[PDB]
């Protein structure tokens, strides 16, 4: 159950806790102290969700929704059947995520590779925690987070959005999206370039990293190189998620009116706010 070159790598060590105690594998997966942890949280949350499935009265994975503690509840607790569960689950989740990340750290150590991977992943977690912790905490209530339901979480987005008109107008929201689209483009382009250099016209030698840079340049006008393209994807992707957390952390905490009104500042500048004509005059 190993790769024809996995061997020489499966040496002992690299852990962060427990030492050689949990330092082993279960088939393809590596366990480590945080492997059992991730499994713990994972399973606990899985259960609690199913419990909520029963309390709710259905096993259809398209109806099962775990709603948080009603607004009134504030930041205190709540009955298991009335938000309590959502809270604990949201605990197992945070945990399972942070575990899943630390487990990566042990694997990065054993292989003598970089730490960029979990480092990035952390961003997803901040983003998450932003929606289910920070934002609600700043706004003063758990009820402000989103439900854990396949479709019931989309409605949350819908509603939460129209709660401020056409969310589009959110400056931060604009940037993020911008990053999301560019990343997609960037990722597409990247793959395409390598595959096209590795799989050239029938009967030709693979292309050279130079044919690669001469092509990419003839599209953008600049040469960013290999180390550069990857450092840009990681950059583009992380940014998007970052400008997203920012995008929300301000919505309802410092901004309350419809995002479209925010742009008035630009229009209302003294030197032109009162000039007749145009659209806003």
């Amino acid at each position: 159950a190993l790769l024809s070159f996995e061997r020489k790598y499966r040496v002992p060590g690299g852990t962060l806790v427990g030492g050689n105690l949990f330092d082993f594998w279960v088939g393809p997966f590596y366990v480590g102290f945080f492997g059992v942890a991730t499994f713990f949280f994972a399973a606990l949350g899985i259960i609690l969700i199913a419990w909520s499935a029963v309390l709710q009265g259905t096993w259809n994975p398209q109806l099962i929704s775990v709603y948080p503690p009603a607004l009134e509840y504030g930041l205190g607790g709540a009955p298991l059947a009335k938000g309590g569960l959502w809270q604990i689950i949201t605990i197992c989740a945070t945990g399972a995520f942070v575990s899943w990340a630390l487990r990566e750290v042990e694997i990065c150590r054993k292989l003598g590779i970089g730490y960029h991977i979990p480092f990035a992943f952390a961003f997803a977690i901040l983003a998450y925690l932003t929606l289910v912790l920070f934002r609600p905490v700043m706004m003063g209530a758990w009820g402000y987070a989103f439900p854990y339901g396949i479709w019931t979480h989309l409605d949350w987005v819908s509603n939460t959005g129209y709660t401020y008109g056409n969310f589009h107008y959110n400056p931060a929201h604009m940037i993020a999206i911008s990053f999301f689209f560019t990343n997609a483009l960037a990722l597409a382009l990247h793959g395409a370039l390598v595959l096209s250099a590795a799989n050239p016209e029938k009967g030709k030698e693979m292309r050279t990293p130079d044919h690669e840079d001469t092509f990419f340049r003839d599209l953008v006008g600049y040469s960013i190189g290999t180390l550069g393209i990857h450092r840009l994807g990681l950059l583009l992707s992380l940014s998007a998620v970052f400008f997203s957390a920012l995008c929300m952390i301000i919505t309802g905490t410092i901004w309350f009116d419809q995002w479209v009104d925010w742009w008035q500042w630009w229009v209302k500048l003294p030197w032109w706010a009162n000039i007749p004509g145009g659209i806003n005059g």
């Binding site: 819908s158 509603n159 129209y162 709660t163 008109g165 056409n166 419809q258 009104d261």
Partner: protein, 124 residues
């Protein structure tokens, strides 16, 4: 004629992403428990921006009702084609604002919905 209700009903659907129709009993005549906008039950003949439950009326909507607006076919149709504009003209204020981020393009659609409104959302 001049407003097919059964046609307006299908139309109103798209309104359901923000509106809902519920009588004073608490029963749904149309809607998905959407609260982004006000309950349209009784909108007919009602004064603009006076629905007791809705707490998100814009300044234009409130001020336009206080000036004497009570939704009748004529004005209703002008509203769903471009709220903000409508609210500006009728309000007389060039800096008025509407919160209904939606525009019903077909003028016919409006007349059909209004009919549906007359058939299902008129508080006796």
């Amino acid at each position: 004629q001049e407003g097919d209700p059964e046609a307006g009903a299908k139309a109103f659907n798209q309104c359901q992403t923000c509106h809902v129709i519920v009588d004073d009993s608490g029963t749904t005549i149309a809607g998905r428990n959407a609260k982004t906008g006000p309950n349209l039950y009784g909108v007919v003949g009602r004064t603009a921006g006076t629905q007791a439950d809705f707490k998100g009326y814009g300044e234009g909507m409130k001020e336009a009702g206080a000036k004497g607006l009570a939704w009748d076919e004529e004005h209703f149709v002008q509203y769903v084609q471009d709220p903000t504009k409508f609210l500006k003209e009728y309000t007389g204020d060039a800096k008025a604002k509407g919160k209904m981020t939606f525009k019903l393009k077909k003028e016919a659609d409006a007349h059909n919905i209004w009919a549906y409104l007359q058939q299902v959302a008129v508080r006796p």
